[PDB]
Short mmCIF file of N, CA, C and O and ligand atoms in Angstrom, two decimals:
data_model
loop_
_atom_site.label_atom_id
_atom_site.label_comp_id
_atom_site.label_asym_id
_atom_site.label_seq_id
_atom_site.Cartn_x
_atom_site.Cartn_y
_atom_site.Cartn_z
N UNK A 1 113.42 128.32 92.14
CA UNK A 1 114.59 128.83 91.43
C UNK A 1 115.67 127.76 91.36
O UNK A 1 116.11 127.23 92.38
N UNK A 2 116.10 127.45 90.14
CA UNK A 2 117.10 126.43 89.89
C UNK A 2 118.30 127.05 89.19
O UNK A 2 118.19 128.14 88.60
N UNK A 3 119.46 126.41 89.25
CA UNK A 3 120.58 126.85 88.42
C UNK A 3 120.23 126.75 86.94
O UNK A 3 119.34 126.00 86.53
N UNK A 4 120.94 127.54 86.15
CA UNK A 4 120.75 127.57 84.70
C UNK A 4 120.80 126.15 84.15
O UNK A 4 121.72 125.38 84.46
N UNK A 5 119.79 125.80 83.35
CA UNK A 5 119.66 124.52 82.65
C UNK A 5 119.20 123.37 83.54
O UNK A 5 119.18 122.21 83.08
N UNK A 6 118.83 123.64 84.79
CA UNK A 6 118.28 122.64 85.70
C UNK A 6 116.80 122.92 85.94
O UNK A 6 116.34 124.07 85.89
N UNK A 7 116.05 121.85 86.19
CA UNK A 7 114.63 121.97 86.45
C UNK A 7 113.80 122.18 85.20
O UNK A 7 114.27 122.09 84.06
N UNK A 8 112.52 122.47 85.43
CA UNK A 8 111.57 122.67 84.35
C UNK A 8 111.95 123.89 83.52
O UNK A 8 112.58 124.83 84.00
N UNK A 9 111.55 123.86 82.25
CA UNK A 9 111.83 124.97 81.35
C UNK A 9 110.88 126.15 81.57
O UNK A 9 109.75 125.98 82.03
N UNK A 12 110.09 121.62 97.77
CA UNK A 12 111.28 121.48 96.94
C UNK A 12 111.20 122.37 95.70
O UNK A 12 110.11 122.71 95.23
N UNK A 13 112.37 122.74 95.18
CA UNK A 13 112.47 123.54 93.97
C UNK A 13 112.41 122.72 92.69
O UNK A 13 112.39 123.31 91.60
N UNK A 14 112.38 121.39 92.79
CA UNK A 14 112.17 120.50 91.64
C UNK A 14 113.29 120.63 90.60
O UNK A 14 113.05 120.56 89.39
N UNK A 15 114.52 120.77 91.07
CA UNK A 15 115.65 121.03 90.17
C UNK A 15 116.28 119.71 89.73
O UNK A 15 117.36 119.32 90.17
N UNK A 16 115.58 119.03 88.83
CA UNK A 16 116.08 117.80 88.22
C UNK A 16 116.77 118.14 86.90
O UNK A 16 116.42 119.11 86.23
N UNK A 17 117.73 117.31 86.51
CA UNK A 17 118.39 117.49 85.22
C UNK A 17 118.72 116.13 84.61
O UNK A 17 119.35 115.29 85.26
N UNK A 18 118.29 115.93 83.37
CA UNK A 18 118.56 114.69 82.65
C UNK A 18 119.96 114.69 82.08
O UNK A 18 120.44 115.69 81.54
N UNK A 19 120.62 113.53 82.16
CA UNK A 19 121.90 113.29 81.51
C UNK A 19 121.72 112.07 80.61
O UNK A 19 121.96 110.93 81.02
N UNK A 20 121.27 112.32 79.38
CA UNK A 20 121.18 111.29 78.36
C UNK A 20 122.48 111.31 77.58
O UNK A 20 122.92 112.37 77.13
N UNK A 21 123.10 110.14 77.44
CA UNK A 21 124.45 110.03 76.91
C UNK A 21 124.53 108.88 75.92
O UNK A 21 123.83 107.87 76.06
N UNK A 22 125.40 109.02 74.93
CA UNK A 22 125.76 107.89 74.11
C UNK A 22 126.57 106.88 74.90
O UNK A 22 127.06 107.16 76.00
N UNK A 23 126.73 105.69 74.32
CA UNK A 23 127.27 104.56 75.07
C UNK A 23 128.67 104.84 75.63
O UNK A 23 129.01 104.31 76.70
N UNK A 24 129.47 105.67 74.97
CA UNK A 24 130.81 105.98 75.48
C UNK A 24 130.81 106.98 76.63
O UNK A 24 131.88 107.29 77.16
N UNK A 25 129.65 107.50 77.00
CA UNK A 25 129.56 108.45 78.09
C UNK A 25 128.56 108.03 79.16
O UNK A 25 128.36 108.78 80.13
N UNK A 26 127.96 106.86 79.04
CA UNK A 26 127.11 106.36 80.10
C UNK A 26 127.96 105.93 81.30
O UNK A 26 129.17 105.74 81.19
N UNK A 27 127.31 105.80 82.45
CA UNK A 27 128.01 105.60 83.72
C UNK A 27 127.35 104.49 84.53
O UNK A 27 126.15 104.22 84.39
N UNK A 28 128.14 103.86 85.39
CA UNK A 28 127.57 102.94 86.37
C UNK A 28 126.76 103.73 87.40
O UNK A 28 126.80 104.97 87.45
N UNK A 29 126.04 103.01 88.25
CA UNK A 29 125.26 103.70 89.28
C UNK A 29 126.17 104.52 90.19
O UNK A 29 125.88 105.69 90.48
N UNK A 30 127.28 103.94 90.63
CA UNK A 30 128.19 104.64 91.53
C UNK A 30 128.84 105.83 90.85
O UNK A 30 128.99 106.90 91.47
N UNK A 31 129.23 105.68 89.58
CA UNK A 31 129.81 106.81 88.86
C UNK A 31 128.79 107.94 88.72
O UNK A 31 129.14 109.12 88.82
N UNK A 32 127.53 107.58 88.48
CA UNK A 32 126.48 108.60 88.35
C UNK A 32 126.24 109.30 89.69
O UNK A 32 126.12 110.53 89.73
N UNK A 33 126.15 108.52 90.78
CA UNK A 33 126.01 109.10 92.11
C UNK A 33 127.13 110.09 92.38
O UNK A 33 126.90 111.22 92.83
N UNK A 34 128.37 109.68 92.10
CA UNK A 34 129.51 110.55 92.38
C UNK A 34 129.48 111.80 91.52
O UNK A 34 129.84 112.89 91.99
N UNK A 35 129.06 111.67 90.26
CA UNK A 35 128.96 112.83 89.38
C UNK A 35 127.96 113.85 89.93
O UNK A 35 128.25 115.05 89.98
N UNK A 36 126.77 113.39 90.31
CA UNK A 36 125.77 114.33 90.83
C UNK A 36 126.21 114.93 92.15
O UNK A 36 125.96 116.12 92.41
N UNK A 37 126.85 114.14 93.01
CA UNK A 37 127.28 114.67 94.30
C UNK A 37 128.40 115.68 94.15
O UNK A 37 128.48 116.63 94.93
N UNK A 38 129.26 115.53 93.14
CA UNK A 38 130.35 116.48 92.96
C UNK A 38 129.83 117.88 92.63
O UNK A 38 130.49 118.88 92.94
N UNK A 39 128.65 117.96 92.01
CA UNK A 39 128.00 119.23 91.72
C UNK A 39 127.23 119.78 92.91
O UNK A 39 126.65 120.87 92.81
N UNK A 40 127.21 119.07 94.03
CA UNK A 40 126.49 119.50 95.21
C UNK A 40 125.11 118.90 95.35
O UNK A 40 124.38 119.28 96.27
N UNK A 41 124.74 117.99 94.46
CA UNK A 41 123.42 117.38 94.50
C UNK A 41 123.51 115.89 94.76
O UNK A 41 124.35 115.43 95.53
N UNK A 42 122.63 115.13 94.11
CA UNK A 42 122.63 113.68 94.23
C UNK A 42 121.89 113.13 93.03
O UNK A 42 121.33 113.89 92.23
N UNK A 43 121.90 111.81 92.90
CA UNK A 43 120.99 111.20 91.95
C UNK A 43 119.56 111.54 92.35
O UNK A 43 119.25 111.73 93.54
N UNK A 44 118.68 111.60 91.36
CA UNK A 44 117.30 112.00 91.60
C UNK A 44 116.57 110.99 92.48
O UNK A 44 116.59 109.78 92.21
N UNK A 45 115.89 111.49 93.50
CA UNK A 45 114.85 110.74 94.18
C UNK A 45 113.50 111.26 93.70
O UNK A 45 113.35 112.43 93.38
N UNK A 46 112.54 110.35 93.63
CA UNK A 46 111.19 110.67 93.18
C UNK A 46 110.28 110.40 94.37
O UNK A 46 109.89 109.26 94.62
N UNK A 47 109.98 111.45 95.13
CA UNK A 47 109.26 111.29 96.39
C UNK A 47 107.75 111.38 96.25
O UNK A 47 107.05 111.11 97.23
N UNK A 48 107.23 111.76 95.08
CA UNK A 48 105.79 111.91 94.91
C UNK A 48 105.47 112.05 93.43
O UNK A 48 106.36 112.14 92.58
N UNK A 49 104.18 112.10 93.13
CA UNK A 49 103.74 112.16 91.74
C UNK A 49 104.10 113.49 91.07
O UNK A 49 104.24 113.53 89.84
N UNK A 50 104.21 114.57 91.84
CA UNK A 50 104.61 115.84 91.22
C UNK A 50 106.03 115.77 90.69
O UNK A 50 106.31 116.23 89.58
N UNK A 51 106.94 115.18 91.46
CA UNK A 51 108.31 115.03 90.99
C UNK A 51 108.37 114.12 89.78
O UNK A 51 109.12 114.38 88.83
N UNK A 52 107.57 113.06 89.78
CA UNK A 52 107.49 112.19 88.61
C UNK A 52 107.06 112.97 87.37
O UNK A 52 107.64 112.79 86.29
N UNK A 53 106.05 113.83 87.50
CA UNK A 53 105.59 114.62 86.35
C UNK A 53 106.68 115.58 85.87
O UNK A 53 106.85 115.77 84.66
N UNK A 54 107.41 116.20 86.80
CA UNK A 54 108.47 117.11 86.39
C UNK A 54 109.48 116.39 85.51
O UNK A 54 109.87 116.89 84.45
N UNK A 55 109.90 115.20 85.93
CA UNK A 55 110.89 114.44 85.18
C UNK A 55 110.30 113.95 83.86
O UNK A 55 110.95 114.05 82.81
N UNK A 56 109.07 113.42 83.88
CA UNK A 56 108.45 112.97 82.64
C UNK A 56 108.38 114.10 81.62
O UNK A 56 108.68 113.91 80.44
N UNK A 57 107.99 115.30 82.06
CA UNK A 57 107.90 116.39 81.10
C UNK A 57 109.25 116.74 80.51
O UNK A 57 109.35 117.03 79.31
N UNK A 58 110.31 116.73 81.33
CA UNK A 58 111.65 116.93 80.79
C UNK A 58 112.01 115.86 79.76
O UNK A 58 112.64 116.15 78.74
N UNK A 59 111.60 114.61 80.01
CA UNK A 59 111.85 113.55 79.04
C UNK A 59 111.13 113.84 77.74
O UNK A 59 111.69 113.67 76.65
N UNK A 60 109.86 114.28 77.81
CA UNK A 60 109.13 114.54 76.57
C UNK A 60 109.79 115.65 75.77
O UNK A 60 109.85 115.59 74.54
N UNK A 61 110.32 116.67 76.46
CA UNK A 61 110.96 117.78 75.78
C UNK A 61 112.25 117.37 75.09
O UNK A 61 112.62 117.95 74.07
N UNK A 62 112.95 116.38 75.63
CA UNK A 62 114.16 115.92 74.96
C UNK A 62 113.87 115.03 73.76
O UNK A 62 114.80 114.68 73.03
N UNK A 63 112.60 114.68 73.54
CA UNK A 63 112.17 113.99 72.34
C UNK A 63 112.59 112.54 72.24
O UNK A 63 112.16 111.86 71.31
N UNK A 64 113.41 112.05 73.17
CA UNK A 64 113.89 110.68 73.14
C UNK A 64 113.18 109.90 74.23
O UNK A 64 113.31 110.21 75.42
N UNK A 65 112.44 108.88 73.83
CA UNK A 65 111.66 108.06 74.74
C UNK A 65 112.31 106.69 74.88
O UNK A 65 113.26 106.35 74.17
N UNK A 66 111.80 105.93 75.83
CA UNK A 66 112.22 104.56 76.13
C UNK A 66 113.61 104.47 76.72
O UNK A 66 114.09 103.35 76.94
N UNK A 67 114.29 105.60 76.95
CA UNK A 67 115.63 105.54 77.50
C UNK A 67 115.58 105.16 78.97
O UNK A 67 114.58 105.38 79.67
N UNK A 68 116.66 104.55 79.44
CA UNK A 68 116.80 104.12 80.82
C UNK A 68 117.73 105.08 81.55
O UNK A 68 118.77 105.47 81.02
N UNK A 69 117.35 105.46 82.77
CA UNK A 69 118.11 106.43 83.55
C UNK A 69 118.31 105.90 84.97
O UNK A 69 117.34 105.50 85.62
N UNK A 70 119.53 105.97 85.48
CA UNK A 70 119.70 105.76 86.91
C UNK A 70 118.93 106.79 87.73
O UNK A 70 118.98 107.99 87.44
N UNK A 71 118.26 106.31 88.76
CA UNK A 71 117.73 107.11 89.86
C UNK A 71 118.57 106.82 91.09
O UNK A 71 119.43 105.93 91.09
N UNK A 72 118.29 107.54 92.18
CA UNK A 72 119.02 107.31 93.42
C UNK A 72 118.67 106.06 94.19
O UNK A 72 119.02 105.96 95.37
N UNK A 73 118.03 105.08 93.56
CA UNK A 73 117.61 103.87 94.24
C UNK A 73 118.80 102.94 94.44
O UNK A 73 119.43 102.51 93.46
N UNK A 74 119.10 102.59 95.69
CA UNK A 74 120.15 101.64 96.00
C UNK A 74 119.73 100.79 97.19
O UNK A 74 119.15 101.30 98.16
N UNK A 75 120.01 99.50 97.11
CA UNK A 75 119.68 98.60 98.20
C UNK A 75 120.51 98.96 99.43
O UNK A 75 121.71 99.24 99.32
N UNK A 76 119.88 98.95 100.59
CA UNK A 76 120.60 99.17 101.83
C UNK A 76 120.95 97.86 102.50
O UNK A 76 121.50 96.95 101.87
N UNK A 77 120.64 97.75 103.79
CA UNK A 77 120.77 96.48 104.49
C UNK A 77 119.58 95.60 104.14
O UNK A 77 118.58 96.07 103.59
N UNK A 78 119.66 94.30 104.44
CA UNK A 78 118.51 93.43 104.14
C UNK A 78 117.22 93.87 104.80
O UNK A 78 116.14 93.69 104.22
N UNK A 79 117.28 94.46 106.00
CA UNK A 79 116.06 94.93 106.64
C UNK A 79 115.53 96.21 106.01
O UNK A 79 114.32 96.47 106.08
N UNK A 80 116.40 97.02 105.40
CA UNK A 80 115.96 98.26 104.78
C UNK A 80 115.40 98.03 103.38
O UNK A 80 114.44 98.70 102.99
N UNK A 81 115.99 97.11 102.63
CA UNK A 81 115.65 97.04 101.23
C UNK A 81 116.10 98.30 100.51
O UNK A 81 117.12 98.91 100.84
N UNK A 82 115.33 98.71 99.52
CA UNK A 82 115.74 99.85 98.72
C UNK A 82 115.65 101.16 99.49
O UNK A 82 114.73 101.38 100.28
N UNK A 83 116.64 102.02 99.26
CA UNK A 83 116.75 103.35 99.85
C UNK A 83 116.97 104.36 98.73
O UNK A 83 117.30 103.99 97.60
N UNK A 84 116.81 105.64 99.06
CA UNK A 84 117.25 106.72 98.19
C UNK A 84 118.62 107.20 98.65
O UNK A 84 118.85 107.41 99.85
N UNK A 85 119.51 107.43 97.68
CA UNK A 85 120.86 107.85 98.03
C UNK A 85 120.87 109.19 98.76
O UNK A 85 121.79 109.46 99.54
N UNK A 86 119.86 110.04 98.53
CA UNK A 86 119.78 111.34 99.20
C UNK A 86 119.29 111.24 100.65
O UNK A 86 119.20 112.27 101.32
N UNK A 87 118.98 110.04 101.13
CA UNK A 87 118.55 109.84 102.50
C UNK A 87 117.06 109.96 102.73
O UNK A 87 116.60 109.67 103.85
N UNK A 88 116.29 110.38 101.73
CA UNK A 88 114.86 110.51 101.93
C UNK A 88 114.20 109.13 102.00
O UNK A 88 114.72 108.16 101.45
N UNK A 89 113.08 109.02 102.71
CA UNK A 89 112.41 107.72 102.79
C UNK A 89 111.83 107.29 101.45
O UNK A 89 111.37 108.11 100.65
N UNK A 90 111.89 105.98 101.20
CA UNK A 90 111.21 105.39 100.05
C UNK A 90 109.77 105.14 100.50
O UNK A 90 109.47 104.15 101.15
N UNK A 91 108.89 106.09 100.19
CA UNK A 91 107.47 105.96 100.52
C UNK A 91 106.67 105.83 99.23
O UNK A 91 106.12 104.76 98.96
N UNK A 92 106.59 106.89 98.43
CA UNK A 92 106.07 106.76 97.09
C UNK A 92 106.90 105.74 96.33
O UNK A 92 108.13 105.75 96.39
N UNK A 93 106.22 104.82 95.63
CA UNK A 93 106.91 103.87 94.79
C UNK A 93 106.20 103.75 93.45
O UNK A 93 104.97 103.88 93.38
N UNK A 94 106.99 103.52 92.40
CA UNK A 94 106.44 103.28 91.08
C UNK A 94 107.20 102.14 90.40
O UNK A 94 107.55 102.22 89.22
N UNK A 95 107.47 101.08 91.15
CA UNK A 95 108.10 99.90 90.56
C UNK A 95 107.27 99.35 89.40
O UNK A 95 106.04 99.29 89.46
N UNK A 96 107.96 98.92 88.34
CA UNK A 96 107.31 98.17 87.28
C UNK A 96 106.73 96.87 87.84
O UNK A 96 107.07 96.42 88.94
N UNK A 97 105.84 96.26 87.06
CA UNK A 97 105.18 95.03 87.47
C UNK A 97 106.20 93.96 87.85
O UNK A 97 107.09 93.62 87.06
N UNK A 98 106.06 93.44 89.07
CA UNK A 98 106.93 92.39 89.57
C UNK A 98 108.28 92.84 90.10
O UNK A 98 109.06 92.00 90.54
N UNK A 99 108.56 94.13 90.09
CA UNK A 99 109.85 94.64 90.54
C UNK A 99 109.70 95.24 91.94
O UNK A 99 108.61 95.64 92.34
N UNK A 100 110.79 95.31 92.72
CA UNK A 100 112.13 94.78 92.40
C UNK A 100 112.14 93.26 92.53
O UNK A 100 111.58 92.71 93.49
N UNK A 101 112.76 92.58 91.56
CA UNK A 101 112.79 91.12 91.54
C UNK A 101 114.16 90.53 91.82
O UNK A 101 114.28 89.30 91.85
N UNK A 102 115.17 91.36 92.05
CA UNK A 102 116.55 90.93 92.23
C UNK A 102 116.91 89.76 91.31
O UNK A 102 117.26 88.66 91.75
N UNK A 103 116.81 90.02 90.01
CA UNK A 103 117.00 88.96 89.03
C UNK A 103 118.40 88.39 89.13
O UNK A 103 119.39 89.13 89.09
N UNK A 104 118.48 87.07 89.30
CA UNK A 104 119.75 86.35 89.44
C UNK A 104 120.55 86.80 90.65
O UNK A 104 121.75 86.51 90.75
N UNK A 105 119.89 87.48 91.59
CA UNK A 105 120.49 87.91 92.86
C UNK A 105 121.58 88.96 92.69
O UNK A 105 122.42 89.11 93.59
N UNK A 106 121.58 89.71 91.60
CA UNK A 106 122.68 90.64 91.34
C UNK A 106 122.21 92.06 91.05
O UNK A 106 122.96 92.86 90.48
N UNK A 107 120.97 92.40 91.44
CA UNK A 107 120.38 93.71 91.09
C UNK A 107 120.15 94.55 92.34
O UNK A 107 119.16 94.36 93.05
N UNK A 108 121.04 95.53 92.58
CA UNK A 108 120.99 96.31 93.81
C UNK A 108 120.84 97.80 93.59
O UNK A 108 120.93 98.57 94.55
N UNK A 109 120.59 98.23 92.35
CA UNK A 109 120.37 99.63 92.01
C UNK A 109 119.09 99.75 91.18
O UNK A 109 118.64 98.80 90.56
N UNK A 110 118.52 100.95 91.16
CA UNK A 110 117.24 101.19 90.49
C UNK A 110 117.36 102.14 89.31
O UNK A 110 118.00 103.19 89.41
N UNK A 111 116.69 101.78 88.22
CA UNK A 111 116.63 102.60 87.02
C UNK A 111 115.19 102.95 86.67
O UNK A 111 114.25 102.20 86.95
N UNK A 112 115.04 104.11 86.03
CA UNK A 112 113.78 104.59 85.50
C UNK A 112 113.69 104.23 84.02
O UNK A 112 114.63 104.49 83.26
N UNK A 113 112.55 103.68 83.60
CA UNK A 113 112.24 103.52 82.19
C UNK A 113 111.50 104.77 81.74
O UNK A 113 110.37 105.04 82.20
N UNK A 114 112.13 105.56 80.88
CA UNK A 114 111.59 106.85 80.48
C UNK A 114 110.48 106.79 79.45
O UNK A 114 110.57 107.39 78.37
N UNK A 115 109.45 106.02 79.75
CA UNK A 115 108.25 105.99 78.94
C UNK A 115 107.09 106.50 79.79
O UNK A 115 107.28 106.86 80.95
N UNK A 116 105.87 106.62 79.22
CA UNK A 116 104.79 107.22 80.02
C UNK A 116 104.54 106.56 81.36
O UNK A 116 104.12 107.25 82.30
N UNK A 117 104.81 105.26 81.49
CA UNK A 117 104.60 104.60 82.78
C UNK A 117 105.55 105.11 83.85
O UNK A 117 105.22 105.05 85.04
N UNK A 118 106.73 105.60 83.46
CA UNK A 118 107.71 106.15 84.40
C UNK A 118 108.07 105.14 85.49
O UNK A 118 108.29 105.49 86.65
N UNK A 119 108.13 103.86 85.12
CA UNK A 119 108.28 102.76 86.07
C UNK A 119 109.75 102.51 86.42
O UNK A 119 110.66 102.86 85.68
N UNK A 120 109.95 101.88 87.58
CA UNK A 120 111.28 101.60 88.10
C UNK A 120 111.59 100.11 88.02
O UNK A 120 110.72 99.25 88.20
N UNK A 121 112.87 99.80 87.80
CA UNK A 121 113.32 98.42 87.76
C UNK A 121 114.65 98.32 88.49
O UNK A 121 115.52 99.17 88.30
N UNK A 122 114.82 97.28 89.31
CA UNK A 122 116.15 97.01 89.85
C UNK A 122 117.00 96.30 88.80
O UNK A 122 116.52 95.44 88.05
N UNK A 123 118.27 96.68 88.74
CA UNK A 123 119.18 96.19 87.73
C UNK A 123 120.59 96.20 88.31
O UNK A 123 120.85 96.83 89.34
N UNK A 124 121.50 95.49 87.66
CA UNK A 124 122.87 95.43 88.14
C UNK A 124 123.53 96.81 88.12
O UNK A 124 123.51 97.52 87.11
N UNK A 125 124.15 97.16 89.25
CA UNK A 125 124.72 98.49 89.45
C UNK A 125 125.85 98.82 88.49
O UNK A 125 126.16 99.99 88.31
N UNK A 126 126.48 97.81 87.89
CA UNK A 126 127.62 98.05 87.03
C UNK A 126 127.24 98.23 85.57
O UNK A 126 128.13 98.47 84.74
N UNK A 127 125.96 98.14 85.24
CA UNK A 127 125.51 98.52 83.91
C UNK A 127 125.79 99.99 83.67
O UNK A 127 125.77 100.81 84.59
N UNK A 128 126.05 100.33 82.41
CA UNK A 128 126.23 101.72 82.01
C UNK A 128 124.88 102.27 81.56
O UNK A 128 124.25 101.73 80.65
N UNK A 129 124.43 103.34 82.21
CA UNK A 129 123.13 103.94 81.92
C UNK A 129 123.28 105.46 81.79
O UNK A 129 124.30 106.05 82.15
N UNK A 130 122.21 106.08 81.29
CA UNK A 130 121.98 107.50 81.50
C UNK A 130 121.67 107.73 82.98
O UNK A 130 121.53 106.79 83.76
N UNK A 131 121.55 109.00 83.38
CA UNK A 131 121.22 109.26 84.78
C UNK A 131 120.48 110.58 84.90
O UNK A 131 120.44 111.38 83.96
N UNK A 132 119.89 110.80 86.07
CA UNK A 132 119.20 112.05 86.38
C UNK A 132 119.74 112.55 87.70
O UNK A 132 119.75 111.81 88.69
N UNK A 133 120.18 113.81 87.72
CA UNK A 133 120.60 114.44 88.96
C UNK A 133 119.50 115.34 89.51
O UNK A 133 118.57 115.73 88.80
N UNK A 134 119.65 115.69 90.78
CA UNK A 134 118.87 116.73 91.42
C UNK A 134 119.83 117.65 92.16
O UNK A 134 120.91 117.23 92.57
N UNK A 135 119.44 118.91 92.33
CA UNK A 135 120.23 119.85 93.13
C UNK A 135 119.30 120.68 94.01
O UNK A 135 118.14 120.89 93.66
C1 MMA B 201 116.07 89.57 81.93
O1 MMA B 201 116.22 90.55 82.93
C2 MMA B 201 115.74 91.77 82.58
O2 MMA B 201 114.24 91.74 82.57
C3 MMA B 201 113.66 91.48 83.90
C4 MMA B 201 112.17 91.46 83.78
O3 MMA B 201 111.80 90.43 82.90
C5 MMA B 201 114.11 92.58 84.87
O4 MMA B 201 113.57 92.38 86.19
C6 MMA B 201 115.60 92.55 84.94
O5 MMA B 201 116.02 93.58 85.87
C7 MMA B 201 116.25 92.76 83.61
O6 MMA B 201 115.98 94.08 83.10
CA1 CA B 202 114.75 93.71 88.03
#
């Protein structure tokens, strides 16, 4: 059971926020937006959660879009973490990622195509985002 307009059409209550360029957000702004609603940026802990999100993407009819996930670099010994505190065990990094390109990439984004792959990118980029509750 999810709140109205969340989850499919854990309780798997993910929600896509696809936005035009004047409404996209940095990673921190997206984290704060999802947390203000009582949730967090989406963590993808297994293939079932990945399928839930992919199916929501297909229903919105817009492909290839980039979305912030809850991926954020921790300490050097931790590497990438989920903002919700869950362990990063399941991974779906794109080929060669995370690559910390130019040493400035400390947040993770989802490429909303069938591969559902993750890429590290600069946290101050403006992206779409996905929340969970
Ligand atoms: C040029 O940088 C972009 O492409 C590389 C892969 O080539 C990514 O790792 C990086 O995060 C950027 O999206
Ligand atoms: Ca990268």
